[PDB]
Structure 1
Amino acid sequence: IVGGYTCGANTVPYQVSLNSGYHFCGGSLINSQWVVSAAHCYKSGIQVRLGEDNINVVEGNEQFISASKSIVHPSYNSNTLNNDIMLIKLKSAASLNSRVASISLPTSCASAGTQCLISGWGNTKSSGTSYPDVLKCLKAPILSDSSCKSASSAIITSNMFCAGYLEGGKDSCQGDSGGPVVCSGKLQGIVSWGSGCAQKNKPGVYTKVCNYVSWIKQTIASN
């Protein structure tokens, strides 16, 4: 997260860290046994880390659970990142408490102007590299599609939405991928991609979760 703030230990209880020997992506707990993340975050042998704040210090509220099954969206396109969403089932149910809670799926899509909360342990520099050990937060509004499309050299589909700032300085970044974008108490997006980080004329692009609720519910009910 670039231009954000320190969230506060466990203030984003649904936020998870995907670990394969180190943190590589974020995710969201949607129920005691399932996590939603980005398909481009797929990796073999994933361990999900819950109740985390500082990812390099055992603080006392963590739960480390290995994935039993990973399900990348059937139509994921690695060249355009269309349908960049993936489901991960945990080997055992997470223990839900005040520091580990699930986030609700949307009943309808959110509109431009709506403020959302984006979080992650990604790079905090638009230029250079600096990875935080504690969770960073950023409040950002959903923008009209044209806001991202105007200066984009890549395809932006109806399965993606634009969020962030046009004058740069604030944005999600590498390492934040797969993380949540929560608006009005609902998981509306997944950190997917962008052109650099916090660059002018180029806000972030996120997977539009509201388009995948049916697939998510059917898959969870059948696995």
Structure 2
Amino acid sequence: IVGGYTCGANTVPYQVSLNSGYHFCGGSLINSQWVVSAAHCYKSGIQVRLGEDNINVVEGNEQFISASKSIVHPSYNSNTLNNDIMLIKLKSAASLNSRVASISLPTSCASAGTQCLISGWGNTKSSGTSYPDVLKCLKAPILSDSSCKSAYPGQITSNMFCAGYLEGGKDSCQGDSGGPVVCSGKLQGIVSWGSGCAQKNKPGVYTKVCNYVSWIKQTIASN
């Protein structure tokens, strides 16, 4: 996250870190047994780490659970990143408490202008590399689809939305992939892609979760 702030330990209780010997993507806990992340974060051998703040220090509130199965969206296209969503089932159910909580799925899609909270352990420099050990947060509004489409011609589908600042300076970045975009208490997006990080007129692009609620509900109930 570039231009964001330190969230504070366990202030984003639904935030997950996907680890395969190191942190490589974020995710969101939707109930005690399932996590939603981005399909481009797919890897075999994932351990889900819950209740994390510093990912390099065991501070006491962590729960490390391996994944039993991963399900990438049936129509995920790795070339366009269209339908960039995946579900991860935990081998054991997590113990929900104040530090580990699930986030609600939306009943409707959010409107442009809505302010959201984006979080992650990704790069914090637009030009450079600085990976933080604690969770960073960023408040950003959903942008109109027109400004999103003018920035990325012929690349935005109805399953994507842009959030951010066209002036640049504030954005999600690599290492934040798969993490949550929560607006009005609901998970509305998944960190998916963008052009560099925090560049002028290049906002971040997010998977539009409101379009996948039936697939998510149907899939977790049958697995």
Distance 2:145 2:202 in 1: 12
Structure 1 residue aligned with 2:127: 127
Change (3 A) 1:130 1:154: farther
Partner of 2:220, secondary structure, is helix
Structure 2 residue aligned with 1:18: 18
Partner of 2:49, secondary structure, is strand
Distance 1:10 1:145 in 2: 32
Tell me the CA shift for residue 153 of structure 1. Answer: 5.1
The answer for unaligned runs of 5 or more in structure 2 is none
Tell me the CA shift for residue 151 of structure 1. Answer: 2.6
Distance 1:115 1:64 in 2: 31
Tell me the CA shift for residue 145 of structure 1. Answer: 1.1
Structure 2 residue aligned with 1:148: 148
Tell me the CA shift for residue 154 of structure 1. Answer: 5.5
Tell whether the 8 Å contact from 1:80 to 1:154 is kept in structure 2 after alignment: no
Tell me the CA shift for residue 152 of structure 1. Answer: 1.7
Tell whether the 8 Å contact from 1:148 to 1:201 is kept in structure 2 after alignment: no
Tell me the CA shift for residue 32 of structure 1. Answer: 0.1
Distance 1:156 1:187 in 2: 20
Which aligned runs of 4 or more in structure 1 are off by greater than 2 angstroms?
none
Change (3 A) 1:79 1:198: same
Structure 1 residue aligned with 2:109: 109
Aligned-CA RMSD value? 0.6
Partner of 1:143, secondary structure, is coil
Change (3 A) 1:154 1:126: farther
Partner of 2:153, secondary structure, is coil
Tell whether the 8 Å contact from 1:53 to 1:135 is kept in structure 2 after alignment: yes
Distance 1:97 1:159 in 2: 32
Tell me the CA shift for residue 219 of structure 1. Answer: 0.3
Partner of 1:150, secondary structure, is helix
Change (3 A) 1:36 1:138: same
Paired residue total = 223
Tell me the CA shift for residue 148 of structure 1. Answer: 2.0
Tell whether the 8 Å contact from 1:118 to 1:139 is kept in structure 2 after alignment: yes
TM-score (norm 2): 0.99
Distance 2:33 2:42 in 1: 18
Distance 1:131 1:104 in 2: 29
State percent identity of aligned pairs.
98
Q: Within 5 Å, which residues of 2 pair with 1:143-222? A: 143-152=143-152, 155-222=155-222
The answer for unaligned runs of 5 or more in structure 1 is none
Distance 2:76 2:26 in 1: 18
Q: Write out per-residue CA displacement over residues 180-212 of structure 1, whole angstroms, 9 at most, x where no aligned residue.
A: 000000000000000000000110000000000
